[PDB]
Design a protein around this nucleic acid. Structure first.
Ligand SMILES: [Mg+2]
Ligand SMILES: [Mg+2]
Ligand SMILES: [Mg+2]
Lengths: 195, 129, 72, 188, 76, 149
RNA sequence: GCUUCCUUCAGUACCUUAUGAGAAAUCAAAGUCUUUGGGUUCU
RNA sequence: UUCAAAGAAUCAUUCUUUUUAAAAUCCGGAUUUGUUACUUUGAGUA
């Protein structure tokens, strides 16, 4: 949909950072005269949709954790959790969470939704020791080690991240029976955004 | 420098398999190599391959089914008599039930079983699992 | 006789103690966009995940089906 | 009066017809070229059908010397003329002989590589397309124990009514000559 | 897909099917009145037919090509 | 590279099409004549080829004329007794030797001279194995200088 | 004309990464090795 | 540097038959074609 694209543009997910990462090349449309990398955006949309579908495919929504150690994605992830069923982590990920049975805050999901495999890399790594699939709202420069789905966005720009999250949530809602198509979803972006 | 094109090609193929490629550009094609590839295809290990004709030693690119465990040359193409085969195969390939030990034989290239069926052993090119 | 699982991408076939390797499940649509009951499935071996080719493999798989449309 | 002389066989069905056509062309001076069938001859012909709704196409086996000297030079004009006259698609080829390597001819001592089977096949492929010129041969080994030669021609032919059909005809003729599957194409 | 590749003629001279990067040039000076013919990547200088003037300045790759001038590629 | 540690791959690589291109007007006879003229004028095979490529419109004498240029020279009878590359090597060697004679302490030059000698001996051997050189032909450091002409 | 940026050659280092290796130190070669044989000289 | 092609049996594969050039030989038909390594059959061995 064009509307989604427009929204994205209004935010900033079209700009990825400098440093390209060869495996991310395909998602990037082209570099600019500045020294930045513009993401193909249609790809971002399609990928996002796919991710949403995958999320939906989980039987119960509660066992699909989401994560951002970033201060300004935390809010967004909380919102996402509230709206879908999914756990958020938000902030300090504990290294034993998906392996260490006996730990208090254990909780082993069927999907892991990272916001950035650069910063939230520990979580990603953990995903390997418990066969958790991992989708990642990753940048241009990010490492895609262990991530199954890479949604190309930007993570630097908190607003953009928030927008992306919102979009994902909307998609999931659409997939489920709760908000029918043709109707736009009521809740806004800014609601997801940090402050 | 090159010496045994075929060996190099096989190594390349093996590497590709290890990585988990799909396609792979075997860089100097050779009649022998082509034959080997055909044989492999026949016994299922390889998919299609598009021997591209330049105007030189051709390139092959070959379509892989994620199925090969290893394939290899055994340089010094030892002459091998029909009685001498069994020991060689025991030495080489992982099970009597499977894998193939490819001989060039005066009845074209064929696997150890084929050779046995025929009667002629010959010089031993390579193998796969 | 447990017959092990073949990585849908690379066909490598994956043992019990692999973990790492994942069976990602993609839910279907029925005309509207609503979640159809059915689910199309891909197992992905650990090796590909480690490499980072996993995403590419997934894309290719999707293309092979109808699920997504660009290939790369 | 002539006509039988233009071919080099005992007149049979279609060869004779072709000869007659050639003679007519010579007489008339159709389109542009004149007195070019004085130079031309032929050895034999073969009519072949294809997997079609309809249509039969024609090999014209030409003595090699003649082909080298005259037919190579003016081929496009000739073929087009033939098409205009006889709606059957036509191809010229040189009757060039193939020799086994190990064999000992009275002639030569060592076969020239011109006469080798593979070389000959290549040459006939080159011949059969002639409005156009080959870009790249490429031999797909199917996993079924088949081999398909996927030939691709240049531009030029893309401005014609007969393209796909022509390609099919070419393929058929190749098959007839050398029991070889083939497929033809062009670039977008 | 290594076989049907698209935009990578920005590979080295060693592609899938090797080409040359060089090509021939239909060239004309401003007022000699003819097709002179040329090879890009020409080492020795080419003198045009009539008044023998430098048409191509020789260099370490792809001749500098004198003054304004104009060149069609030979094509095919 | 045979002798250095050089590993470069700078190369001519000819085009796929090896039947001459449409735009080539020159008939073979004319080109042959031109080649002959060039040969007479003192040019060597490679040089001749280069000249043909540049000054005249012709990429490869092999596509216009069935034969390669050395072959045609041979046919015409203006082929050198002493092959191109070999001759060049000999010349180089001679030059080196002169320098050595002049200038005795140059070690690097001496080393390189040895290398060139070795290469000559390879090339020389190869030519002997064919029939371009006679079997009675050693290369001598004393004679060498006279040989080139 | 030079300068930058892109691609590419040949050098040449470094960084992360190895369901690659290794006894480990470490190593893009010390990898493609009990899934053992590309060639070859020396020890 | 002769690649290949087609038919019959069996449980995608196995074993078999037939032809696709050129030269010499035989009454349009039918039948010989580098050397060695290697390999297969033999032979001959107390
Ligand atoms: Mg050396
Ligand atoms: Mg090299
Ligand atoms: Mg060893």
């Amino acid at each position: 949909k064009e509307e989604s694209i427009a929204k994205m543009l209004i935010c900033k997910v079209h700009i990825g950072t400098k440093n390209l990462e060869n495996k991310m090349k395909r998602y990037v449309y082209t570099r600019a005269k500045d020294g930045v990398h513009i993401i193909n955006l249609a790809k971002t949309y399609e990928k996002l949709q796919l991710a949403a579908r995958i999320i939906v495919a989980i039987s119960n929504p509660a066992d699909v954790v989401v994560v951002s150690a970033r201060p300004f994605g935390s809010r967004a992830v909380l919102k996402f959790a509230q709206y879908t069923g999914a756990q958020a982590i938000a902030g300090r990920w504990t290294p034993g969470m998906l392996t260490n049975q006996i730990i208090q805050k254990f909780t082993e999901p069927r999907l892991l939704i990272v916001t950035d495999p650069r910063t939230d890399a520990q979580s990603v790594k953990e995903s390997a020791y418990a066969n958790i699939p991992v989708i990642a709202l990753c940048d241009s420069d990010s490492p895609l080690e262990h991530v199954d789905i890479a949604i190309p966005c930007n993570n630097k720009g908190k607003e953009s991240i928030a927008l992306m999250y919102w979009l994902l949530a909307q998609e999931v809602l659409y997939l489920k029976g709760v908000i029918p198509r043709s109707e736009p979803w009521n809740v806004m972006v800014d609601m997801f955004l940090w402050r | 420098v090159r010496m045994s094109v075929l060996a190099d090609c096989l190594k390349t193929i093996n590497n590709a398999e290890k990585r988990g490629r799909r396609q792979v550009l075997i860089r100097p094609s050779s009649k022998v190599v082509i034959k080997f590839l055909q044989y492999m295809q026949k016994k299922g290990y390889i998919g299609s391959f598009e021997i591209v004709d330049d105007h030189r030693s051709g390139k092959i690119v070959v379509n892989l089914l994620g199925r090969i465990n290893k394939c290899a040359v055994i340089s010094p193409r030892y002459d091998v008599k029909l009685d001498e085969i069994e020991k060689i195969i025991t030495s080489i390939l992982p099970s009597r039930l499977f894998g193939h030990l490819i001989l060039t034989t005066p009845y074209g290239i064929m696997d150890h079983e084929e050779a046995r069926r025929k009667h002629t052993g010959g010089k031993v090119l390579g193998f796969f699992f | 006789i447990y017959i092990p699982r073949k990585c849908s991408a690379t066909s490598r076939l994956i043992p019990a103690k692999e973990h790492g390797a994942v069976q990602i499940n993609v839910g279907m649509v029925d005309a509207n966009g609503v979640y159809n009951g059915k689910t199309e499935t891909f197992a992905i071996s650990g090796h590909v995940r480690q490499n980072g080719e996993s995403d590419a493999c997934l894309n290719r798989l999707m293309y092979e089906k109808k699920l997504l449309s660009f290939q790369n | 009066a002539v006509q039988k002389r233009v071919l080099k066989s005992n007149p049979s069905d279609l060869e004779k017809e072709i000869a007659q056509c050639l003679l007519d062309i010579e007489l008339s001076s159709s389109s542009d070229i004149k007195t070019d069938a004085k130079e031309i001859k032929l050895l034999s012909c073969d009519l072949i059908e294809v997997e079609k709704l309809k249509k039969k196409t024609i090999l014209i086996y030409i003595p090699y010397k003649i082909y080298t000297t005259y037919v190579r030079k003016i081929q496009r004009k000739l073929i087009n003329e033939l098409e205009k006259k006889t709606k059957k698609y036509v191809v010229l080829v040189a009757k060039r002989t193939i020799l086994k390597g190990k064999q000992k001819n009275k002639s030569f001592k060592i076969i020239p590589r011109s006469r080798t089977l593979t070389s000959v096949y290549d040459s006939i492929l080159e011949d059969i397309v002639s409005p156009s010129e080959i870009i790249g041969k490429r031999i797909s080994m199917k996993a079924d124990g088949k081999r398909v030669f996927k030939i691709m021609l240049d531009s030029k032919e893309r401005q014609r009514d007969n393209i796909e059909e022509k390609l099919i005809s070419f393929a058929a003729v190749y098959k007839k000559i050398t029991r070889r599957d083939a497929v033809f194409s062009l670039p977008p | 897909n290594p076989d049907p590749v698209e935009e990578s003629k920005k590979h080295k001279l060693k592609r899938l099917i090797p080409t040359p990067n060089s090509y021939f040039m239909d060239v004309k000076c401003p007022g000699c009145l003819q097709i002179t013919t040329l090879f890009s990547h020409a080492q020795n200088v080419v003198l045009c037919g009539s008044c023998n003037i430098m048409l191509c300045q020789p260099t370490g790759g792809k001749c500098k090509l004198t003054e304004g001038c104009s060149f069609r590629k030979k094509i095919e | 590279r045979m002798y250095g540690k050089g590993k470069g791959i700078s190369s001519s690589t000819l085009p796929y099409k090896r039947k001459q291109p449409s735009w080539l007007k020159q008939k073979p006879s004319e080109i042959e004549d031109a080649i002959i003229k060039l040969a007479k004028k003192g040019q060597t095979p490679s040089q001749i080829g280069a000249t043909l490529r540049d000054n005249y419109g012709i990429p490869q004498v092999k596509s216009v004329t069935g034969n390669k240029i050395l072959r045609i020279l041979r046919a015409q009878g203006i082929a050198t007794t002493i092959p191109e590359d070999l001759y060049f090597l000999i010349k180089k060697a001679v030059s080196m030797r002169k320098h050595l004679e002049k200038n005795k302490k140059d070690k690097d030059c001496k080393f390189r001279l040895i290398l060139t000698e070795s290469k000559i001996h390879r090339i020389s051997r190869y030519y002997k194995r064919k029939k371009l050189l006679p079997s009675n032909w050693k290369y001598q450091s004393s004679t060498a200088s006279a040989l080139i002409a």
